[model samples]
Target chain A: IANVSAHRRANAFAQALEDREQGKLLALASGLGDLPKPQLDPEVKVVQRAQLVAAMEAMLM
Target chain B: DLVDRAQAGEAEAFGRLYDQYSDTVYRYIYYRVGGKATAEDLTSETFLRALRRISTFTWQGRDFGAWLVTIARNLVADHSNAALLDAVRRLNPQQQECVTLRFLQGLSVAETARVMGKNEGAIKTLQYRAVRTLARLL
Candidate 1:
C-alpha cells in the first residue's frame, strides 16, 4: 500500500493484502449475501443489502 | 554477540546492531512519517542518536525494539508537527494514537503503548473505539 525504498516490495505487499482480502470478502459475500438471494422477504432484503454494502464499504476503507 | 559487544563499547559492534534492526526500524519510521525519504532520514538520525547515547543503554527489562521505537518517537516529535494529528486528536487523542500507531507502525497494542505511554487497558478500549470510528468514517 505504501511506496518505500523498493517499488517491488511495495507492490508485493499491496498485492498480497489485496488477494487475501479479496478471497475472504468473496467467501463472506457468497455465504451471507449472494447465495441465498431470493428466499428473503422485503425487510430481509433491505437488511441483507445493507450488510453487503457495509462490508463493501469496509473493504475500500 | 553484536548487541552485547555494542553495549560494551566495541565501536564496530554498532554497525552489526544496525544490520539486525535497520529494516524493521525503517518500516516503523516509514509508517510514522508516511513517506520514504522522511522515514529514511529519521531512521538514520535515530541510529546516530542511539550511537551517541549508547553508553546509557542499560540492558534492563527494556527491549531494543522499544529503545529504537522511543528514539524514533522523539525524532518524530521533534521534526514532525502534530498539527495534523491534533486535528484528529480534537475528537480523541486515545483513538488518534491507536489508529495512527497501529496503521502506521504495524505495532501490536503492547508495542503501541510502549511508544505512546498509554496503558494496555485504555489502548484496548481505544482500539475498539477506533474501529468503530473508522467504520463510521468509511
Candidate 2:
C-alpha cells in the first residue's frame, strides 16, 4: 500500500510538472509578438558607415 | 516549432526561448535570493544549463518554464548561503522542500505540492511547520 501510494505520488508530480511546462509554452507562444524588443539607437553615422565600407573594401582587395 | 528547432540545436531558436523566459526566471530567482545580481547570475547559469542539456529535453507537452524553475531550484540548493541552508537543513526533507518551493520560490500551495509530488494538504502542513521553524531558526 505504501509503495503504491509513493508511486502514485511520484506520477502525479511528474504529470503536474509536464502540465506546468505546457502552460508556460502555450502562454509564451500566444504572447510571442506582444513582447517588446530592446530599443536600438536610430541615428546613423555616415562617417562610421563610410569608414566601415572602406575597411571592408581594403580587406577584400 | 521554435522549441523543436531549439531541440534540434538551432542556437537562434534557443536565443528566442531565452529572451522569452529570462525575465520571468529572473523574477522568480530574485525573490528567493533577495539580491538582483545573484538572481541575474543564477538566471544566466540556469539558461546555460538548459542550452547544454536542451538535447535531453523531451516535449512532455509543457512550456520550458517549469524546467527552468527546476534547474533554478537545484542551483539554489547547491549554491545558496551556508547559514540559511543550514537552517533549512534542520527541516524534515518534505518540510524543507515545501518551504523552499513555497516561500523561497514563491509557489502557491497547489504548485508547491504539485512540484514536490505531495498533496496540497501535506504541502500546507509542511509549509506551516517549516515557516514556524525557520522563524525560530533565522
Candidate 3:
C-alpha cells in the first residue's frame, strides 16, 4: 500500500538525515576516521546494561 | 487481511497481533525505561493505544511491526531523556533497530546482525552512523 503519510514521513526524515552534511560533520568531530567506532562513556555503558537487564526481566514477566 | 479484520472489529485477529509483538514491544519499552515495572506498564499501554489507533495504521510497502515499535517509542519519548531519545527517534529505520538491539538491548553485534538479517559489517556501519547522527543531533 502506498500510504501517502508514511511516504511523506520517510522522505522528510531521509532529507533530514542528509541535510547539511551533518553526518559528515559528526564523523569528523568524533574523529571516527576510517570508520572505527567510538566507545560510549562508562556511565552510559552502565545505564545501557541496566536497560538490557530490565528488558530481559520484563520479557520474563 | 488480518489488519483489515482487526479494523473491522475482531478480537482474535487483534489477539494474534498482540501475541506476535508483545515481547518485542516489552523489550523495546524496558530498554528505553530501564525498569521492568515501567516497561510492563508502558507495554500494555502501547497495545491499548495501538488498538485505539489501529484505525489509522496503513501499509506503506508493509511495516506492521514497526508501527508497534513507533508506538512504543512515542510512549517513551513522552517520558524521559527528552532530547536524546528524540534524536534516537529521528534515526533512519535500520539505524533505530541497530541502536535498540545492539546498544539499548545489549545484543551482541552478531546477534543483532542475525536478527536484522544484515551482515556484521552493515550492522556496524548502521551503528556508526546512528551514533554519529545522534551526537550531531544532541
Candidate 4:
C-alpha cells in the first residue's frame, strides 16, 4: 500500500512536469504571440493602512 | 525562506523571485537570440514554467540562477534564430555548451562547468576554442 501510494505520487509529479514542458513547447512553437501577460498586484500592502495614516498624522503634528 | 514559500504556492513569493531573476535571464536570452521581442517572450515563458514547476524544485545548495539559465538555454536551443543556431552549430558540442553557458548566460567558469558536468579546466579549454572559432566565423 505504501509502495502504491508512492508510485502514484511520483507519477503525478512526472505528469505535471511533462504537462508544463509541453505547454512551454507549444507556446514557443506558436511564436508565443498574443498571450495574456501575467498580472501582478502592485498594491499588495504589507502594513496596516490605519497605522500608516496615524504615523503620518503624528509626523504632521 | 522565499524559495520555500514560493515552492509552497505563495504567489507573492514567486513574484518576488520573478522580479529578482527576470532581468538577468532576459539579458542572457537576448545575447543569444538577438531580438528584444523574442527574448522577452522567452523570458516570460521561463518564469511561467518556473512558477509551474516550483513544487518540484529541490535546493541542492545552488542558487536559483543556475536553474533559470538551464531553462533559458533549453528555450534558446529550441527557438533561436537560424543565424544564432548556425553559429552554435559551428562549435563542437562541448564548446557549444561551454560558450553559451559562459558567454551568453553570464555564468562564472565554475558555474558553467557545474551545469555542463565538466571540470573547470575543460570548460576553460572549450571556451577558448569556441571563442577562437567564433571570432574566425563572425
Candidate 5:
C-alpha cells in the first residue's frame, strides 16, 4: 500500500534527521561553529505538508 | 545503588545520576535546540531541575532514558520557542512524539503511543512523516 511505503520512508527520514542532528552537534562541539555558518539546504526549507507530498510522490516513482 | 540513595535524598547520589546521563541528555537537548550553547545550558538546567525533584522519581524499572527525555523536553519547552516550533514543524504531531520518545526517551513506538494515548497506526504515520521531513531538512 502507498501508506505502508510512505511510512517506511518517513521512518527512514526521521532516523536521518537524528543522525544529521548528531553530526551537526559533533561538528559544533568540536569547533566547527568557528567557521562561517553553512547554508541550510533549500529542500529542507519547504513547508512540512509540501515536503511530505513530495516525498510520497518520489517514493511512488 | 545510586537511585536507591538518590531516592532516599542523598545529594551525592543525585550528582552521580546527573553524571551518568548528562552527555546523552545534552545531546538530545542539542538536537532539539539546534545549537550547542543552548543545549549545554539547558542540559545543565535539566539536571539541576531533576536534582530538585529527585525525591519525586518513582523507580518502576530504572528507565533513566525516559526520565532524561522528559526533563530535556520540559527544558526545551521552557527555553526555546524557535527550536520547539522548528521541531514541531519538521514533523507532524505523531512524528515528533516518535522522535522524542524513540531517540530522546528510548521508547518504542508502541510504548510511546501508549504513553501518548495514540494508536499504533497513527504513530507509524507520524514516524514516517517525521522521517520524510527530516530527510528533506537535514
Candidate 6:
C-alpha cells in the first residue's frame, strides 16, 4: 500500500529520460527495473489484486 | 517470520507472502515479456513454484523476491540483456560510439569527450540521449 521510496526513486530516474527512446527502456525497466512506477487508481489496484489472488487460489484449489 | 511460518506449512502466511510480492513478480515478468497475458501466466507460475517449494527455501539474508525472480528469470531465458545489446545498436552512430566507449569499454566521460572531439556537455548529452534511447528501445 505504501511505496513512498519507490515513487521517489522512479521520479528521480525520470529526470534521466531525454526522449521517447529513454521512455521505452523505462517502460521495459519499470516496476522491477529502475524506472518510474506507473501510478494507478486504488480501485483498479484492488481489482487487480483480487484477480491475482483469485487466479492463484484457483490454482491452489 | 512470515516466511518461516510459510515454510512451516502455514497457508495463510504464504498468502501474506504472496500479497507482498506478487506484484514484484508480475512486473518483473511483464517488462521482460512485454505482453500482459504472458506476464500473467508466468507471474502465476512464479508463485506456484514458490508455493510448492517454499519449504526448501532458506532465508540466506537475501530477498525472497530475489529467489522468486530467479525462477521467473529462468523461465524467461534472460531476454533483458539481449534486448539491451539490440538497444545499443539502435542508437545513432555517435550515441552508439559514446556508449561503447563510456560504458562497454569503461572510459571516463572526460576521456570519452576527447575521443568524440566534443566538450564535456556534448559528451554528457550524447550519452544522456543514448541512455534515453536505450531505455526507450528496451
**Candidate of highest TM-score:** 6
How do the residues B38-135 of candidate 2 rate in per-residue lDDT, one tens digit apiece?
Answer: 67567767876776676678856766889999999999888723345546646765676676667656789998778778888888778888888978
Error of 4 at B103 (Å): 39
Looking at model 2, residue A5 earns an lDDT score of: 83
lDDT (Cα atoms) of all candidates against the true structure: 0.59, 0.63, 0.66, 0.63, 0.59, 0.67
Candidate scoring better on lDDT of 2 and 3: 3
Per-candidate TM-scores read: 0.38, 0.39, 0.39, 0.39, 0.37, 0.41
What DockQ does each prediction reach against the true complex?
0.01, 0.02, 0.02, 0.03, 0.01, 0.02
- Per-residue alpha-carbon lDDT of candidate 6 for residues A1-61, written as tens digits (9 for 90 to 100): 4689778767766775433234565677554555565333232233234433444444445
Q: What are the per-residue Cα lDDT tens digits for candidate 1 across A1-61?
A: 5556478765665675556434664567456644432121222222222332233233334
lDDT per residue (tens digit) for residues B5-78 in model 1: 76655544565666666666666677677665567557666776776676677766857767988899999989
State residue A57's C-alpha deviation in candidate 1, in Å. 55
Residues B15-97, model 5: lDDT tens digits = 56655666667667766886664665576566656655656777577566578789789879887322333555546445665
Per-residue CA lDDT of model 4 for B1-138, tens digit only, reads 777876555556665676677667877887798666577667766765665566678867756788899999998999823334346545765776676677556789999888888899988888889888877876
Name the weakest run of 10 consecutive residues (lDDT summed) in model 5 chain B.
Answer: B80-89
Please state the Cα-based DockQ of model 5 relative to the true two-chain complex: 0.01
Instruction: Give lDDT for model 3.
Output: 0.66
By lDDT, the better pick of 1 and 6 is 6
TM-score ranking from best to worst?
6, 2, 4, 3, 1, 5
lDDT of 6 by residue, B41-131 (tens): 5765677677667656865675688999899998788433434554664576688778777876678999998877999899988989989
**TM-score-best of 1 and 6:** 6
- Chain B vs. true chain B: TM-score per candidate: 0.52, 0.53, 0.53, 0.54, 0.50, 0.52
* Candidate 6 chain A minimal-lDDT segment of 10 residues: A39-48
- For candidate 4, the clash count comes to 0
Model 6: docking quality category = incorrect
lDDT of 3 at A48: 32
Of candidates 5 and 1, the better by TM-score: 1
Candidate achieving higher lDDT, 1 or 4: 4
Q: Candidate 1 chain B: minimum summed lDDT over ten consecutive residues — where? A: B80-89
Model 1 - which docking category? incorrect
